Amino acid sequence: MPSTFFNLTMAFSLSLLGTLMFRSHLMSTLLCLEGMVLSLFIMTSVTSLNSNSMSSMPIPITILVFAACEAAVGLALLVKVSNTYGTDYVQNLNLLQC
Amino acid sequence: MNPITLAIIYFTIFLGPVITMSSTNLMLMWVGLEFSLLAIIPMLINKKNPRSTEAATKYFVTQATASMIILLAIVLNYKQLGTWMFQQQTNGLILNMTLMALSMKLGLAPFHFWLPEVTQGIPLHMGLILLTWQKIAPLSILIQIYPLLNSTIILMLAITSIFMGAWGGLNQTQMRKIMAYSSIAHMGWMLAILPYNPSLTLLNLMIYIILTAPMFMALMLNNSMTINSISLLWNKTPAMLTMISLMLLSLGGLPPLTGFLPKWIIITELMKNNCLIMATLMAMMALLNLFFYTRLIYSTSLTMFPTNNNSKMMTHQTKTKPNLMFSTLAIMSTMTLPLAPQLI
Amino acid sequence: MNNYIFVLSSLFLVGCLGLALKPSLIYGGLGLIVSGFVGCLMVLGFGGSFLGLMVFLIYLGGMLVVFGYTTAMATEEYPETWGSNWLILGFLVLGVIMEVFLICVLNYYDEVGVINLDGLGDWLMYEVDDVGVMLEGGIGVAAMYSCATWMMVVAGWSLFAGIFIIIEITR
Amino acid sequence: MNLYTVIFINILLSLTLILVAFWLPQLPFSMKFFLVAITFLLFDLEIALLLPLPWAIQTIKTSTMMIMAFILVTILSLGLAYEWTQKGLEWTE
Amino acid sequence: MFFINILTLLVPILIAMAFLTLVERKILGYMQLRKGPNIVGPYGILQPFADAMKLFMKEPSMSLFIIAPTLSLTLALSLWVPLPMPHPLINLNLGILFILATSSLSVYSILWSGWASNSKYSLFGALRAVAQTISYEVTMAIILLSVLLMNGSYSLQTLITTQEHMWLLLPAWPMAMMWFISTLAETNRAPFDLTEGESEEYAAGPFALFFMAEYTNIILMNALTTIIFLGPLYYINLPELYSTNFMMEALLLSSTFLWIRASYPRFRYDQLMHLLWKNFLPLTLALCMWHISLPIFTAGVPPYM
Amino acid sequence: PGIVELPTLEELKVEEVKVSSAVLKAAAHHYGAQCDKTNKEFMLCRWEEKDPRRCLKEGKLVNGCALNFFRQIKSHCAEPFTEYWTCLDYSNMQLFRHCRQQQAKFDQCVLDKLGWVRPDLGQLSKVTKVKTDRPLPENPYHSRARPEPNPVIEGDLKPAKHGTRFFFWTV
Amino acid sequence: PFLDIQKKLGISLDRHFMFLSAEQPYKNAARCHAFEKEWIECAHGIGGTRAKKECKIEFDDFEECLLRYKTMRRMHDIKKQREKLMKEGKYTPPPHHSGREEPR
Amino acid sequence: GRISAFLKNAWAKEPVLVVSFSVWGLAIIMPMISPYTKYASMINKATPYNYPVPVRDDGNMPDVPSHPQDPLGPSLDWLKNL
Amino acid sequence: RMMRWNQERRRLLIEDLEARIALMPLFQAEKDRRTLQILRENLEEEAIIMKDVPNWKVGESVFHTTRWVPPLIGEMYGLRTKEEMSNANFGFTWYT
Known about the structure:
- This is part of a larger assembly, with nine protein chains of nine kinds.
- Chain A has helices at about 1-20, 25-50, 60-85.
- Chain A is an all-alpha fold.
- In chain C, about 70% of the residues lie in helices and about 0% in strands.
- Chain C has six helices and no strands.
- Chain C has helices at about 5-20, 25-45, 50-75, 85-110, 135-140, 150-170.
- By secondary structure, chain F is an all-alpha fold.
- Chain F has five helices and no strands.
- The interface between A and C is large, with 65 and 73 residues.
- It is classed as oxidoreductase.
- Keywords: Complex I with mutation, oxidoreductase.
């Protein structure tokens, strides 16, 4: 348990780095967000089923649904961006600095 | 945005914080945070212009990272103890992460370089909410967990916000960005006092709100979002000045007004608790906020700038937007210092 | 088949690492699908059959599908492939070497904490109701319909609002 | 072990077939699609919420499960009908 | 032992898929008033092997190129594992959910093929077919979520002991009229085979694999119907009899598919998505609520061993 | 910190039943009443005291009773009981549906030769008190004293003194 | 908490499973039920700083029940020493540990 | 009259919605009507997925029985008489 | 007919669960004696295994409770072979 748990936390940290550093795209960031969410759901269900607790299981479902909707609105925004500029790049957002 | 959608989104926005607070479960708190985030994004992006979309992307990304971090904190606490709530027996790294996230979610520094851009891309009637009904739940979370915090980094963060917000406000002309920097500084004051007495953060927040909301009403009036576009107030509507000047001096925190009282009793607490050095820094660097409020007072009232002819065609008209609560809050801000004890 | 969970864990690590070393999205989505697969298998090995299958049915079938959908219909892998994948592959190799040696270092200082290697197989299940029916995560997830109704109504409202939000956005 | 055996067997059989195949011889956007994918999500999430009935039903608070089911279904249908009326299911551009 | 059983489960089903291609050709010919293949061998029992040899003889990103068909075929074959006939190879509670997952996945292959082929022409149809498949799998899942409340367990064995007395069609036929249709979409069969109707990239080998998996899924969905809504006779002394009746009904459904393919025209994409979103989803929700209430305003609330 | 007590292998060595699950599941019903006092008393001991190392003398009695029960069932009516479990174990889940007309025969034999009567439906899922001779303990958790609450402050709630005591804001 | 609307209405929506030993559905008690039931009873009636120092004898045991760091280490040292002995050539594991026995 | 005309129209124009709404109404309404509803909760309470831990007799409680097969306890005969 | 059949199925379920009820006590006692013997053997071996070290104890309850403690499969089968440890962990989870 402890080994796999530390490794899952490492994976969360790696998705954190992926989101906090870019490579000229946005879908990569959102996918790293999804990776975070997956690691979290897994760690929570693991904790629950290891403690044999049951009433605490609805939480993974809840946060998974919320991550689904969150990524959905993020994709909608990405799409509006691509359809108003011409692509989903990141260096096009040089505005608002004035 | 048709009425059903408008109503549902306003409901979810009025809900997110209510749940985040009335709930004793960190998962429900995080949920309310996500509610605010989601239900707000549209109101930012309604005009569907490129600037609005860009601001929406920035806002969403930062707040997403923040929410996921807070979730990591909660889950680690679960593995550690079993309860879904924070206790006095949690490895301080978890609290530090929670604090970084709450900060990035508020606008504190150095997690603050996304607030001015967004608040410039936004209109007024949504920047107002962004500044005055999204910084509440993230603060209730702290109100719940103030004892066991890390005063060191809390204070470093607060004072960093003070400095950076003031230094940016010295320059920014765009009134939206100015208001944003002022928000940064006042939230710095709050976080500075927080782990000693929370009611004082509550007070600083309510006061900053009562000063901000009416300013944004006076702006919504004309959509004048610039110094050279607000200086013309003495020819468009010469009435709002006798109150705007007062409210800006207040936001600065001049004694006879009310905006002073918060800083005053806050310094009192920090002196009781022997933090006089950082108290001195805060008190000697609020003066730049006072400065770039005075510099707008100048532009608007104390001196009259060149107007534009078509303002005559305007004056021939009339205007009945400015509701009663504007004046009510302006007064109950400026002229209520005698009632500080009844406020504590 | 004792190293099972450690292996699945390392593979999830590597999937998230291949997503953090942002590659071309077409060769990052495969890493994500692998990540989800392996994480579900870990959950299953622990005993959350319902949770694992829920993942297979929703995460992959529901979210990765639409991710690829949107990506294709709204993205172009411009020629940014100046051997970028072939570079980050060796970079990933170096990182995985770093991690292997990092764990082989840790195991010395920490023995019964971070990881117990000599007895790795142990310490997955701690207790269990041998003679007990009704002990699967199905019951915990069904809770929402008798107790904890707040979860269900909140998710319902999240969707009830996400519909309006998405549509009002796209226009 | 059993599912591992079966899956490895199936994969290896398919790869034998493909290796035989290889040896024997010697764009703008359409908002409608994204909206449809979004509907699919917001329904899969309902499915995740709704599957556990075969165990939520054997409890004692029938007056609660019956209700919550009706609630989910009806509010989802309301959102669907609103999407329809606001023309998310017409396909004419 | 186990390898023997997996062989018994994999070889005969490929044989049956080949001879099912044959049966399709023959029945379509006999409905169009012609014979069909009667030459290559006695009554046409060698045309399939002929096609196999020919395809593997035909000349032609390797990653996608291979993983897509391989993935699809492996999923289609694994789908068979958990079925009861009458005692299954792998008894899994949540077996039908495993089925649904492994049936939905192949969309990844459909989509990778497009994202590889730069042809806007190809992405067009890829998106269209992916969307229709998704939308119909939704209801394919809700139907089970609304029926299985009759047996409070996602297993596939309990279906049999349930149907011991009666079938599952006399009730729930408002669903069977659907589960016998969505199966014509996930399979991209008629009258929803537009994905092969409007053409303007599958080589010989990968085409063979795609078609293998297609007809495998045909057989398998028909078997699922024969198990769910057409409960066989489980007299424990006669597993042979169970398997036999199952065979019969599976063949019947697999010939009904062909009646259809011959008789009807194809659906225009927009008309099809209209069909779903405005005829099946409201009915589906309401019928699910109906079958949720039934075990409450009736004692018929089932058990969970 | 602190030693643990334990019994010894050389003791608590009783000759177990070693009979199969099918036979147990078949004969249970009668054994539900026959040999019920002992089993109920044992479950009560185990639920009151969480010390299996203290609830042992009530296990050898249980096994002895079960054996003196299977002994009567061996003496009388053995073949009906053998064909019975050979009919049960054939199935997978060992259900009582596929053996009905091989059950009432055995039942009538057991009756016509003994004063047993197969319990009715819902006769064992009922709490039945059990008269014993040993006492009930307290502090079974071996807990510790509860540290004293905070001494409460009280007295009539009269007003402030000299005002808010704030800076010259008397009233 | 912050806004005690729940306590005012005398109701509960989330706070009935805020921790481990709440009422689980089919009476299936969790792992460290007893240790939780004692930690809470010592941390009731008093607030915070009292408990953070006068409940350690009841909370360390709980954290161990929950994680068992010390038991992990105990078993680890045991097995390490046993391996070293079987290397040097002094041990000889008996059957009950070495692969068979006369079980129940 | 307007209602009758509207339904006489819908029953040819768009019946699907009529069927759906009628089913919805039937589902929401019948549970409040039928007499065989409470029996479900009674059953699922009777079903013993756990063990019925017994109690002592240091008092004069006459309700609980000293034996399972005795009649002094809560009965459910209506189950088989159903 | 579905109703009249589901009710009979519930009755059969009650029968099976009553059987399990009647048999639980016996099984509980067997399991208890078995785990106690297991721990006694772990102890009789631990003695000789770790007698040659300094300031080491024998069956030292890591708690300060005196309360009985459900032992972990780790403790019990920690000295037996991977065979048994896995036949314990992944027994129900690897399809019989």
